[PDB]
Structures are given as C-alpha cells and as structure tokens.
Amino acid sequence: TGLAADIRWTAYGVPHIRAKDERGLGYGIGYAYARDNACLLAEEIVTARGERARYFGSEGKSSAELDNLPSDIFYAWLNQPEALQAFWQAQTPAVRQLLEGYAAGFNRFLREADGKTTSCLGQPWLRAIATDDLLRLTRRLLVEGGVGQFADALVAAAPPGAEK
Amino acid sequence: SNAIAVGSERSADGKGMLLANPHFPWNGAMRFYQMHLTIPGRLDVMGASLPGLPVVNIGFSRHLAWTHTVDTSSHFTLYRLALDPKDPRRYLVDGRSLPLEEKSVAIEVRGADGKLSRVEHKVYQSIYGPLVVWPGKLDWNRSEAYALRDANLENTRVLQQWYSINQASDVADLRRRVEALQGIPWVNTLAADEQGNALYMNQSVVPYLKPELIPACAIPQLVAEGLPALQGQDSRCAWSRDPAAAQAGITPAAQLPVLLRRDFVQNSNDSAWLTNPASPLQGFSPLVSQEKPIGPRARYALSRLQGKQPLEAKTLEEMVTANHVFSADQVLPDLLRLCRDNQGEKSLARACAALAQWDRGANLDSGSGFVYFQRFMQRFAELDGAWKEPFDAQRPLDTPQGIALDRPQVATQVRQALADAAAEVEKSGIPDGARWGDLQVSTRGQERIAIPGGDGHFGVYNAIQSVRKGDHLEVVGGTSYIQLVTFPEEGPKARGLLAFSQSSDPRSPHYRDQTELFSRQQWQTLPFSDRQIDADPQLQRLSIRE
Numbered sequence: 001t002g003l004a005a006d007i008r009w010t011a012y013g014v015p016h017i018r019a020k021d022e023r024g025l026g027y028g029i030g031y032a033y034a035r036d037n038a039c040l041l042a043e044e045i046v047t048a049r050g051e052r053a054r055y056f057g058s059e060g061k062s063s064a065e066l067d068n069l070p071s072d073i074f075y076a077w078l079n080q081p082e083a084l085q086a087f088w089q090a091q092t093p094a095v096r097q098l099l100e101g102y103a104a105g106f107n108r109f110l111r112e113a114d115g116k117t118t119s120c121l122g123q124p125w126l127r128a129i130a131t132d133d134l135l136r137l138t139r140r141l142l143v144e145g146g147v148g149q150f151a152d153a154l155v156a157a158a159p160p161g162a163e164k
Numbered sequence: 165s166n167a168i169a170v171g172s173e174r175s176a177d178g179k180g181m182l183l184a185n186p187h188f189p190w191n192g193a194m195r196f197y198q199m200h201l202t203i204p205g206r207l208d209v210m211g212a213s214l215p216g217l218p219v220v221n222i223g224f225s226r227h228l229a230w231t232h233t234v235d236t237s238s239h240f241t242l243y244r245l246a247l248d249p250k251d252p253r254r255y256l257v258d259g260r261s262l263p264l265e266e267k268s269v270a271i272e273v274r275g276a277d278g279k280l281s282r283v284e285h286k287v288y289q290s291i292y293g294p295l296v297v298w299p300g301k302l303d304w305n306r307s308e309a310y311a312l313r314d315a316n317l318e319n320t321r322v323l324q325q326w327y328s329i330n331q332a333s334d335v336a337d338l339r340r341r342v343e344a345l346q347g348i349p350w351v352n353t354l355a356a357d358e359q360g361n362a363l364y365m366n367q368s369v370v371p372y373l374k375p376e377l378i379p380a381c382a383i384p385q386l387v388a389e390g391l392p393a394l395q396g397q398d399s400r401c402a403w404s405r406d407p408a409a410a411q412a413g414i415t416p417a418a419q420l421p422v423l424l425r426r427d428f429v430q431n432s433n434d435s436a437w438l439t440n441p442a443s444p445l446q447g448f449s450p451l452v453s454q455e456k457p458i459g460p461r462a463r464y465a466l467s468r469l470q471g472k473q474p475l476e477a478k479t480l481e482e483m484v485t486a487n488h489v490f491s492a493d494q495v496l497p498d499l500l501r502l503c504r505d506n507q508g509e510k511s512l513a514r515a516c517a518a519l520a521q522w523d524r525g526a527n528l529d530s531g532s533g534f535v536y537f538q539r540f541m542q543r544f545a546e547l548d549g550a551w552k553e554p555f556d557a558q559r560p561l562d563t564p565q566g567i568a569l570d571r572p573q574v575a576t577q578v579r580q581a582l583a584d585a586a587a588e589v590e591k592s593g594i595p596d597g598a599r600w601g602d603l604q605v606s607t608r609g610q611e612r613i614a615i616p617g618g619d620g621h622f623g624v625y626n627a628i629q630s631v632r633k634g635d636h637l638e639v640v641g642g643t644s645y646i647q648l649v650t651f652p653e654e655g656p657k658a659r660g661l662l663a664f665s666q667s668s669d670p671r672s673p674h675y676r677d678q679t680e681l682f683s684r685q686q687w688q689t690l691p692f693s694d695r696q697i698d699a700d701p702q703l704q705r706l707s708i709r710e
C-alpha cells in the first residue's frame with residue numbers, strides 16, 4: 001500500500017508512467033509490462049528460479065536454448081537464498097522501492113487478467129511474483145557476460161574416474 | 165549493436181545527436197520494451213528496458229541521450245588449477261594442497277508419468293569460483309581443471325547504476341555517475357547532449373590485474389584465442405586490489421578507456437581502439453581493450469563518418485535503412501572479375517548473373533545475389549592468404565581489401581569456393597526470381613512478415629540474425645529498439661521503433677504493429693513532452709492504486 005500510478009499509452013502501446021515516488025513508479029511499470037508480456041516474464045522467472053524441469057520436463061529448453069535440467073541446475077546454483085539475500089541487502093532504498101512497486105503492479109494485472117492480452121491464462125506457472133524473482137532475473141542478466149556463457153560447462157564439471 | 169554520438173563540430177545544428185541501434189534477441193529475457201518514466205520534478209526519462217527491470221537501459225532525457233553496445237573487455241577470468249598429484253579433488257596454490265568445496269542443489273523434474281522426481285547435483289567450487297568442463301578444451305583430468313571467476317557476481321550496483329544514469333543531466337554528469345559507481349556489467353556507453361558533447365566510455369566491471377603480472381599470470385595458449393585465462397596455482401595471480409575501485413578486484417575507472425569529443429564517437433562491438441581514429445585509444449590492459457582489426461560494421465560506419473561535412477539526423481537514419489552489405493565492397497569487385505574470367509563455365513553461370521544483378525543490399529527487394537554472396541563469404545573466410553591486401557595495422561580502415569587473383573592457388577581456391585557456394589544455393593528450395601524478403605521473415609501467429617537487414621558479420625549496419633525454420637529464415641535477434649535523438653529548442657526530438665513490437669503475446673494489439681512498420685522501414689516519433697503525448701489521437705490513460 002501507498003502504491004499509485006498514472007499511466008498514459010501513446011500509439012503502439014508505449015506506456016508513460018507518472019508517480020510521486022519509486023514505489024508508485026514501479027507499480028505502473030510492472031502493471032504496464034504485465035499487460036503486454038506477463039507470459040514472457042513468468043517464463044523467464046521460471047528459468048531464473050531453476051523450475052523449468054518442474055513445469056515442462058527435462059525434454060524442453062529455455063529461451064536461451066539451454067536444456068531445462070542443466071539450466072535449472074545452473075540457476076538454482078546462481079540464485080541460492082544466501083546470494084539473493086546479500087544482493088537485496090546491498091540495494092538502495094530507492095531501488096528496493098522500485099522493485100516492490102514492480103512486483104505489486106505485475107501481480108495486480110495478473111489478479112485481473114481475463115485473457116484479453118494474456119495467452120497463458122490458467123497455466124500453473126503464471127503466478128504472482130516477488131521482489132526475489134526480479135533479483136533472480138537481475139543476477140541472470142549480470143552473469144550473461146561471464147559464468148552464464150559457461151552454464152553447460154559448469155553443469156558438466158565432474159572429477160575424473162579410474163580412466164587412462 | 166551500433167552506436168554513433170555526433171557533437172557540435174559535426175552536427176548540422178551544432179548540438180548533440182545520438183543514433184542508438186542495439187542488436188539483441190527478438191525473444192526471451194533480453195527482449196527490449198519501450199517505456200517513459202516520470203517522477204515530476206526529479207526524473208523524466210524515456211527509452212527501452214529489459215524484462216523485469218524497473219529502470220530505463222537505453223534512452224534519453226531533456227538534455228541527454230545514451231546507448232550501449234557489447235564491449236570486447238573481459239568480465240570474468242578462467243583459472244587453470246594444478247591438481248594435487250595424490251587427489252584430483254584437491255588443487256595446489258603456492259604448493260599447498262586445498263580441498264574443492266561441494267555445493268549440492270536439488271531440482272524437481274516432471275516425468276513421463278506427470279509426477280515430480282528429485283535430482284540432486286553436486287557443483288564443485290574452488291577459491292576462484294565453480295569448475296567448468298568444455299570437453300576436448302578445458303578438461304578436468306588428473307593433472308588440471310578450470311575454475312571460472314565472474315566479476316559481475318559481486319556487482320550489486322547494476323540497478324542503482326541505470327537508475328542513476330536515468331537521472332543524469334548531460335554528458336559530463338553521465339560520466340561522473342558511471343565512473344563513481346562502476347555498476348555497468350558488460351557494455352560500452354555512448355552518449356550525446358544538447359550542448360554538443362559526444363562521449364564514449366568502455367566503463368564496465370572488468371577483472372583487474374596490475375600490468376606487470378600479466379605476462380607470467382596469463383595462460384599463453386588460451387589467451388592466444390582471446391580466452392581470459394590465468395594461472396590458478398600462484399596466489400599472486402589473484403585479481404589486484406586498488407582502493408580506488410568500486411568493487412574489490414575490478415579495474416579503477418581511471419584505467420578504462422574514455423573518449424570525450426565534439427566531433428563524433430562510434431562503436432560496433434570492436435574494442436575502444438578506433439572509437440574515433442583521429443584519436444586512437446591505446447595502451448590498455450589486454451583484459452580491457454586491444455588493437456584488433458575492426459569488423460565490417462565499424463569500417464562501414466567510419467567510411468560514412470570521416471571527413472568534414474555536417475551529419476544530419478537523416479544521414480544516421482539512412483546508415484541503418486540503406487541495408488548496405490558492406491563486406492561486398494571488399495570482395496565483390498574482384499569476385500565479378502573472376503566471374504568475367506570464367507564465362508560459359510556452366511557451374512558458375514547462375515551465381516555470376518545473380519551477383520552482377522545484385523544491388524549489394526539486404527533490402528526486402530534485394531536479389532538472390534545476397535544469398536550467393538553469403539554462402540561464398542562463409543567459404544572465403546575459411547581460406548588462407550586470399551586477400552589482395554591483408555590487414556594492415558597502419559591502414560586499419562581500408563584493409564583487408566580485394567581478392568589475390570594474381571596468385572594461381574588463390575584463384576583456384578576462390579573459384580572452387582564460388583562453385584561450392586553456388587551448389588549449396590541451388591540445392592536449397594529457393595524459387596526463381598525470389599527476393600531476400602521472401603526468405604527472411606518474422607512469424608506472427610499464422611502469418612509472416614518480411615524483415616530487411618542481414619548478418620552483422622557481412623557488414624550490414626542493420627544487423628539481423630536468422631535461423632533456418634522449414635521454408636524460411638526466421639529472425640531471432642538484431643536491430644531491436646531504435647532511437648535517433650536530436651535536441652531542438654522545444655525539447656528532445658526522438659524518432660525510432662521497437663522492431664519486434666511491444667508485446668510478445670499474439671493476442672495483443674501491439675504484437676506486430678511496429679513490426680509491419682519495421683518491414684517498410686518507417687520510423688516514428690517517440691513522444692516525450694506532454695505536448696507530444698497529448699497530440700496523439702490514440703492516447704489512453706488509466707490511473708491505478710492499492
């Protein structure tokens with residue numbers, strides 16, 4: 001609560017969010033983005049939570065074209081509770097507010113959606129989100145310049161056996 | 165990605181100007197989204213951001229526009245471990261045997277039968293980070309293993325950093341705000357302001373090693389192919405600490421390239437070196453920037469930008485929408501000559517006619533010459549010593565250039581490459597008279613939309629990466645959010661498009677509307693002032709609270 005935003009859309013569904021503070025600003029962003037891309041975000045948060053194999057089985061891939069089970073092992077390793085808690089504790093109050101407003105505005109769209117712009121309506125993975133989910137997405141993008149390029153290699157790393 | 169920032173010495177109005185043409189995927193977690201954010205009195209910024217992020221990543225404000233491109237700097241290092249000769253789960257540092265640590269994660273997996281099973285997986289870690297196996301290249305055997313330390317794992321500053329850039333007033337303020345926080349993960353920044361300053365920064369989070377350490381700390385074979393690889397059995401190869409750096413182990417802002425000019429700066433994913441050739445950026449750590457040959461997009465851009473004539477908004481727009489295949493400039497004159505030298509050689513007839521009729525472009529209407537040229541170039545690239553003039557460090561803008569047809573082993577190999585390319589092209593199911601736009605499309609529900617542009621590796625500024633799907637090339641990434649910003653007296657004038665449209669959902673009114681526009685190369689106003697927003701006859705408004 002104490003979340004409010006004024007949203008104007010111009011041609012091509014570009015939103016213009018006005019708010020008096022970061023929480024209201026994030027509330028308008030999250031709600032406007034959900035209207036256009038709720039399914040995409042829910043999918044990418046599933047990936048970043050390491051829950052692809054849980055909803056989709058081991059036969060499919062993420063949008064980055066990794067197999068679901070190696071992708072999940074990578075993101076479970078990346079986004080462990082202690083890493084997320086340390087990342088959160090290092091955020092400025094303004095950024096914390098932006099993120100809380102975003103999750104609440106996204107969840108508000110989801111509470112009301114009737115499918116007009118949301119093709120994955122009723123799927124079990126289309127779920128309310130939390131600020132930790134947006135930190136999971138953030139960390140996933142941070143490491144795309146680094147260990148994320150070696151995700152398969154991380155999953156493959158196993159010590160040698162008895163061989164010659 | 166491309167970026168060009170023009171300043172008061174070269175723009176037609178004597179103010180700043182910025183072309184932002186980032187190249188990123190058309191789906192998934194890096195799919196750009198347009199938005200404008202305003203807290204009246206202290207924030208007003210518009211641009212595009214990535215999924216999940218409540219800040220603008222590339223955009224503009226009343227006096228500033230900025231954009232990014234992926235840099236060539238290293239953002240991690242690999243460490244080669246010397247394993248304990250008694251135990252391949254221990255490794256040596258300064259001669260002392262250390263145990264790897266184990267962290268297990270547990271994943272639920274949905275089965276054939278619809279039930280969940282649990283899969284436990286052990287991740288081994290060293291003091292540097294997790295171990296990584298790339299079979300045949302980075303193995304884990306009884307002698308050695310590789311660990312990977314990623315510098316952005318400790319970068320907790322990235323969102324504050326973009327929020328800070330969103331609040332920047334001009335180029336000087338932007339530079340202060342980026343150099344102070346060092347939160348940018350892995351891209352260059354380029355910007356222009358109303359006063360006419362043009363700024364390039366290779367200011368990101370880059371592992372720091374003092375320069376005297378590099379020669380013994382490098383793994384010489386791995387660095388040869390540009391992998392940032394260090395000796396992990398020597399404690400003096402740890403990233404160097406410097407209390408001026410915002411994060412322990414990263415390069416201080418003072419040691420990262422920056423160029424501030426009043427004429428122009430540009431980058432198309434090459435290093436900092438030739439951002440503007442009148443002032444080369446040289447002398448950096450090899451983890452930061454090296455003097456390598458520039459790819460064809462940068463060569464193309466530098467060919468349009470150098471000289472003394474003013475640059476108009478229109479000129480920068482047309483560098484994108486011309487779809488010129490600049491790599492053709494280097495090889496196609498010599499290639500057509502080989503074609504003339506081989507007339508009535510029937511394996512080459514269709515190829516040579518397609519190539520001679522071709523407009524050298526990746527336009528919707530461009531002829532099948534482009535497809536022959538691509539498959540030939542894929543082969544030409546795998547040939548040795550075939551350039552008439554090879555790369556010349558003293559002429560980095562005009563080399564390599566031309567085919568060495570005066571060397572019979574080359575003329576034979578080049579001819580053979582052209583026959584093999586032509587065979588591949590003929591074996592595929594391309595109709596007669598089909599154009600580039602009949603082949604390269606973006607699917608939208610049950611329909612298709614033709615997309616202009618081609619792979620950045622062939623020097624098309626408008627870079628578009630596609631993959632074969634059935635009977636078509638399906639676009640997967642490239643030109644994405646486009647913004648071209650100038651600064652007339654009333655307020656910033658911004659023009660562009662989001663190529664793939666606002667919404668990834670097929671049910672949305674905004675699933676393909678800008679994609680139809682992108683196909684016809686018709687950029688639009690990006691409305692920013694309340695006067696522009698209110699003039700829009702599609703204007704809609706909703707206020708929400710809880």
Ligand SMILES: N#C[C@@H](c1ccc(Cl)cc1)c1cccc(Cl)n1
Nearest residue numbers: 138141142221232322349350351
């Ligand atoms: N660096 C970097 C990344 C990046 C990495 C992390 C985050 Cl949280 C935001 C951006 C990037 C990706 C795509 C586009 C841009 Cl502009 N920047």
